[PDB]
């Protein structure tokens, strides 16, 4: 809830502050990246001075034996080329332990997130989550991962990833924990140069239940804004590769007759599929009222443009000049939009595009039939419970530095 929040790190007025009301101080030291589209998200590195230090208020510093408490945040961990990170070395990212290492710690290993809780005596207990290498499409690598840790002093300590419980060891044998005065976001003792992303750090003074953890997982990022592949906000005037949720091992290509194919198999670096294959699209505002920003929201009316080259965009439209129920999606070389718009919508991280006529008539959600990208109304009545439901769901992949493939 909010009655339990004893620390909330939020961006406000050029810096990071505590909105809990307990007045903890937050200091940026060095070069800390701030995400332009969501400044609550920040990135620390290890090649230069780059840290965030939270000096906790004297009232909230954990110094009990029986008091339940929870920690919540999101972390983004890039693997880059997927080779440089292949090393067995536990490095810490969030440190809340005193000189005698009493308190708590969040540390990373190769494709691993570790939580550590140590008492005053020196007794410790650890939980971990290893997501492994990408086998097809990874749901974790270079994406925002929601990490929650609940601690019932008269029971188990539980680690949740994306709202799902994955590890629970008991903490009954731990006595008094006197956590650090400072919470230090810093990459310490990493073999390689890297950066790490953190957002929405919260401390609560109770054991959160699955319901509250799911409420956090659902509501913390703006439900109104659409998400990209990595879990950032979906943007206008940004080049994206496409991924179909039902066909993760396939990408979209252009045909000479202006149609789009889905019968192209994605290559693999080791097991991992190439994300940077196929056509590129850009989302354009139809009603450019100027004042509005670059974030794509639910029910937004947009144009989907195919990118032939950086400076050459062409409208994607539904070819309604057929007797078929489903209409092939085509590229317009003339620039004609054929009196159509697209309505954007979302189910979680999955995006829907509804091709409609300007007269208000439905043409269909963007899906596929056989080997061709089409618009179909079928999805309207089969969006949840059907083998083929997920055919209308899409992810937008932005070419970024944190995911390298060559």
């Amino acid at each position, epitope marked *: 809830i909010k009655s339990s929040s004893v620390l909330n790190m939020r961006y406000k007025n050029d810096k990071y502050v505590d909105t809990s009301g307990y007045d903890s101080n937050i200091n940026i030291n060095g070069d800390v990246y701030k995400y332009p589209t969501n400044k609550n998200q920040f990135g620390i590195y290890n090649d230069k001075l780059s840290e965030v230090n939270i000096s906790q208020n004297d009232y909230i510093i954990y110094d009990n034996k029986y008091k339940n408490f929870s920690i919540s945040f999101w972390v983004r961990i890039p693997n880059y080329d997927n080779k440089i990170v292949n090393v067995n070395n536990e490095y810490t990212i969030i440190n809340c332990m005193r000189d005698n290492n009493s308190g708590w710690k969040v540390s990373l290993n190769h494709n691993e997130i570790i939580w550590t809780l140590q008492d005053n005596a020196g007794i410790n207990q650890k939980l971990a989550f290893n997501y492994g290498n990408a086998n097809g499409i990874s749901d974790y690598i270079n994406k925002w991962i929601f990490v929650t840790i609940t601690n019932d002093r008269l029971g188990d300590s539980k680690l949740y990833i994306n709202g799902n419980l994955i590890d629970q060891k008991s903490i009954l044998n731990l006595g008094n924990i006197h956590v650090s005065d400072n919470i230090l976001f810093k990459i310490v003792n990493c073999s390689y140069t890297r950066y790490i992303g953190i957002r929405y750090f919260n401390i609560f003074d109770k054991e959160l239940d699955e319901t509250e953890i799911q409420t956090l997982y659902s509501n913390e990022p703006n439900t109104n804004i659409l998400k990209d592949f990595w879990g950032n906000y979906l943007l206008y005037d940004k080049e994206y590769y496409l991924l179909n949720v039902l*066909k993760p091992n396939n990408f979209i290509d252009r045909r000479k007759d202006s149609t789009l194919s889905i019968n192209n198999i994605r290559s693999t670096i080791l097991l991992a599929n190439r994300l940077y294959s196929g056509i590129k699209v850009k989302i354009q505002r139809v009603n450019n009222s100027s004042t509005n920003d670059n974030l794509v929201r639910k029910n937004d009316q947009v144009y989907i443009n195919f990118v032939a080259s950086k400076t050459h965009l062409f409208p994607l439209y539904a070819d309604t000049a057929t007797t078929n*129920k489903e209409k092939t999606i085509k590229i317009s070389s003339s620039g004609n939009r054929f009196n159509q718009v697209v309505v954007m919508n979302s189910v979680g991280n999955n995006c829907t595009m509804n091709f409609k006529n300007n007269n208000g008539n439905n043409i269909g959600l963007l899906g596929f*039939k056989a080997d061709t990208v089409v618009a179909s109304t079928w999805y309207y009545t089969h969006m949840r419970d059907h083998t083929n439901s997920n055919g209308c769901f899409w992810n937008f992949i932005s070419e970024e530095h944190g995911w390298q493939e060559k």
Partner: nanobody
Amino acid sequence: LQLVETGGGLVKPGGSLRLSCVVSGFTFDDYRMAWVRQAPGKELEWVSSIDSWSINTYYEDSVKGRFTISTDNAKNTLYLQMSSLKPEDTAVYYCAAEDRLGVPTINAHPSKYDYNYWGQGTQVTVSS
């Protein structure tokens, strides 16, 4: 990723044929199989379809009862047993594969993009 049909010939009204289509590159687990006819002068016309995972076979009103679609247990050969043949059946017959994960619509007058793979075709002639 190929389909090859055979079994077509010349017959009299009331005769029988057995069309087969051998596939290479995929099994019937990931594809719905189809027979489509093209009679001289007319456009492509869907004959039949089968889902191997299920026991669901589909026909058009004009052929139900006389034509039967089948697959083997190897899931790589498609059959159409045609009986009580009428002169209207005279056409080139193609075997086709649709990706099962796509929109499950069945258009009666399909274009090339309605199916993933088309065969070479086999001629069926019903002559007096």
